[PDB]
Write a protein that binds this ligand. Structure first.
Ligand SMILES: O=c1ccn([C@@H]2O[C@H](COP(=O)(O)O)[C@@H](O)[C@H]2O)c(=O)[nH]1
Ligand SMILES: O=c1ccn([C@@H]2O[C@H](COP(=O)(O)O)[C@@H](O)[C@H]2O)c(=O)[nH]1
Ligand SMILES: [Mg+2]
Ligand SMILES: [Mg+2]
Ligand SMILES: [Mg+2]
Ligand SMILES: [Mg+2]
Ligand SMILES: [Mg+2]
Ligand SMILES: [Mg+2]
Lengths: 160, 158
């Protein structure tokens, strides 16, 4: 059903260079990968300070190619299964582009992955801006962020 | 406060080259411009068939530079005014990136422009999918598309 995700990336007004993606399903399943293919040299101060140091070591199994990340996601999202895929992110526009651009043009996205990401910030407001726990101090790690989104979704919808 | 928008574009898995944008305000004002800087030859065949033939004739003052559009939108969104700007689109992730990239990186976005666009399909599904008017015949005109969004929005919230 529902997957909560987050991406980190280098975004320059022209392209979104994927750094990492973290995806967490309602059932406990977790997926995380860092792209072997971005150029850390292009990163700004913010990404250098808050994103790059949080990444795993060089010989970690979490470093994958963009082709590998896509294949992994086709499997993790159970694209050929019978459940409807519902994607969720907090402030998700660039994240949705960065995710879908793993298959290239909007055209090439599996007919089974939705063409929009539901916006958890919009749900939060809708239900009367309820108090959320503090963001974790590990944030800017795509997996920690994705996990925290599932947490807030559970809290927000807890009397729906 | 509330703006409903849509863009047409050429997107290749790497860049989103803006063709056009229409923005309609809840108060009734409308904006529409077509970019003189996208390369029509780079268009995939779907865009060639559905989007390009609906563009105004070349001599139209509707044709504006990217910098003109950005300046038009700063004034049209009253980004220096008093009001909260709230942006709305229907499945508008790509639309949102295309709009922000008129300023540049997300770094360069004016402080009062929201960092996210609300997703009108999500609201529609949250309100239980109420019955909508049939499609405009002139769809994939961004202004048309944007006008319909406000129309749906008003329906959903009545
Ligand atoms: O103040 C901010 C917040 C986010 N980002 C960019 O957005 C991506 C998503 O960050 P989080 O939020 O997730 C980051 O990897 C980074 O490139 C910035 O540049 N500045
Ligand atoms: O079947 C479709 C639908 C949309 N688009 C692209 O999405 C943009 C926005 O279309 P609408 O949605 O507005 C178009 O300008 C075009 O690049 C396609 O390529 N194929
Ligand atoms: Mg993010
Ligand atoms: Mg998120
Ligand atoms: Mg993050
Ligand atoms: Mg559209
Ligand atoms: Mg210009
Ligand atoms: Mg449109």
């Amino acid at each position: 059903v529902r997957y909560f995700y987050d991406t980190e990336f280098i975004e320059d007004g022209h392209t979104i260079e994927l750094i990492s993606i973290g995806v967490v399903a309602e059932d406990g399943r977790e997926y995380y990968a860092v792209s072997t293919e971005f150029d850390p040299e292009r990163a700004g101060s913010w990404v250098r300070t808050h994103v790059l140091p949080k990444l795993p070591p060089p010989a970690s199994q979490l470093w994958r190619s963009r082709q590998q990340i896509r294949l992994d996601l086709e499997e993790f999202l159970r694209i050929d299964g019978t459940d409807s895929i519902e994607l969720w992110a907090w402030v998700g526009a660039y994240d949705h582009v960065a995710l879908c651009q793993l298959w290239g043009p909007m055209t090439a996205l599996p007919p089974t992955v939705p063409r929009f990401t539901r916006e958890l910030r919009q749900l939060w407001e809708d239900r009367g801006c309820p108090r959320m726990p503090p963001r974790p101090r590990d944030v800017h790690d795509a997996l920690v962020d994705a996990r925290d989104q599932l947490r807030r979704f559970r809290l927000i919808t807890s009397t729906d």
